[model samples]
Target chain A: FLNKAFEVALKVQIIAGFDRGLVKWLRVHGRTLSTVQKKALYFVNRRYMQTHWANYMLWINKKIDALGRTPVVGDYTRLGAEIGRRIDMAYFYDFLKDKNMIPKYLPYMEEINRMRPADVPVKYM
Target chain B: FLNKAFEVALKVQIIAGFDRGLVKWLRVHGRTLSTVQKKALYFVNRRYMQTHWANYMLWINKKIDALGRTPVVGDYTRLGAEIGRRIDMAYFYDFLKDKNMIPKYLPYMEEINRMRPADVPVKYM
Candidate 1:
């Protein structure tokens, strides 16, 4: 399930990478960005991502509270699939093809798909 | 409270950045690291950080469950302070001083301390 979620996350990241204008803007302005500005952008981006993930976890916690039971791996798998579908629908994958960047991302995508999830540490589990 | 927590997180990040051998190893071999290896390292580092933060959140969730109520900001603030103190005790800060890297981190640390936390979005709240 964690593997499935990881896959979904990678897909989301790829889609986000292809942002319609943001990527181009960054490419053009990146060198001009000051160190402080870069750090601020990094911080904001991280917080934005964390907020979304936290919201999902908050929803799951509510579900667990209502059910009065622990969530199974299936629950997480389904959640991953749902998120995957949502991103798949939302993004324009053709953008990657248009930019000829598919080859660039393809190897990393294939590698992540091939790699097995490491055993989660017992303490974390 | 989020600001306070962010401050603690920043401190922890600085301490982690000073890992005795790992930083030196990376500095020496960083240019030689393959793209795939870099991605793998990034994934591992992120997962390691997530595990620790998730563990803290899990503890907080348990506290909330036992109390049968929503947690106030104080809970998170206290948790952050506890983690900060733990990291402070566990690491040798003088290592950074010895390496003459204190100046590099000092500005970012001061910046984070000065900045106010943006109001969290209502939906996230």
Candidate 2:
């Protein structure tokens, strides 16, 4: 059933491919993920769904609701990123556990699991 | 309420940049999006949510359910893509028509709106 799906699987990319400087710029600037986007991400984690890009936003929202709006990226985005990363881990692991028949299966999953934050390089220019 | 949020708004790189050829490869061969990813997208569309990434998968699932298991990319994944694209259009449109006070707001919203279907590319690369 899952055979065809694997046919298209590519290697997973590193998360730290996230350039801190760029992220800071985005966080401080990049259209700053919309309220709806934030709401969507928050609900995604809150409801236990793993979003592919960002992490769940609920935790940040909870913290913000508790505290007045400060300059923080807040708990929500951080929680969402964590949730997003964990989802990546779980998805890669899930993809690997059953798929080996495909000689083409590039072990992207296994490679990702072995990487650490620093091992993940910032995507270059 | 939405002020600080838009402060960091950066222009969305044109969907068709120097990397479009790569997307074709990802779609044709890269590890494809997952069932959960598909499911997440499908739900995103079916529930009327426009995902920032892929579209909803429900319609594709619907199409598959109606047909027998065939080699098609299946209705769910296709449905998700369609949903995803529509969401992008709707989203960029929504982002515009307001919040123009910031010159840093480089009109990424309008640029996306002008893109054609072919101009919109898949991204697994």
Local lDDT at B91 for model 2: 27
Steric clash pairs (candidate 1)? none
Q: Which digits, one per residue and each the tens of the lDDT, describe model 1 over residues B9-115?
A: 43354334423234454566567545544333332222233334545556555764676676565555555445434433112223222221111112223333333
RMSD of each: 21.5, 21.5
| lDDT of model 2, residue B44 | 21
As for model 1, its CA RMSD to the true structure in angstroms is: 21.5
**Off by more than 4 A, model 2:** A1-125, B1-51, B55-66, B71-95, B101-116
Local distance difference test scores for all models: 0.37, 0.29
lDDT digits (tens) for residues A43-76 of candidate 1:
3222223324544555545664676666555555
Weakest 10 consecutive residues, lDDT, candidate 2 chain A?
A5-14
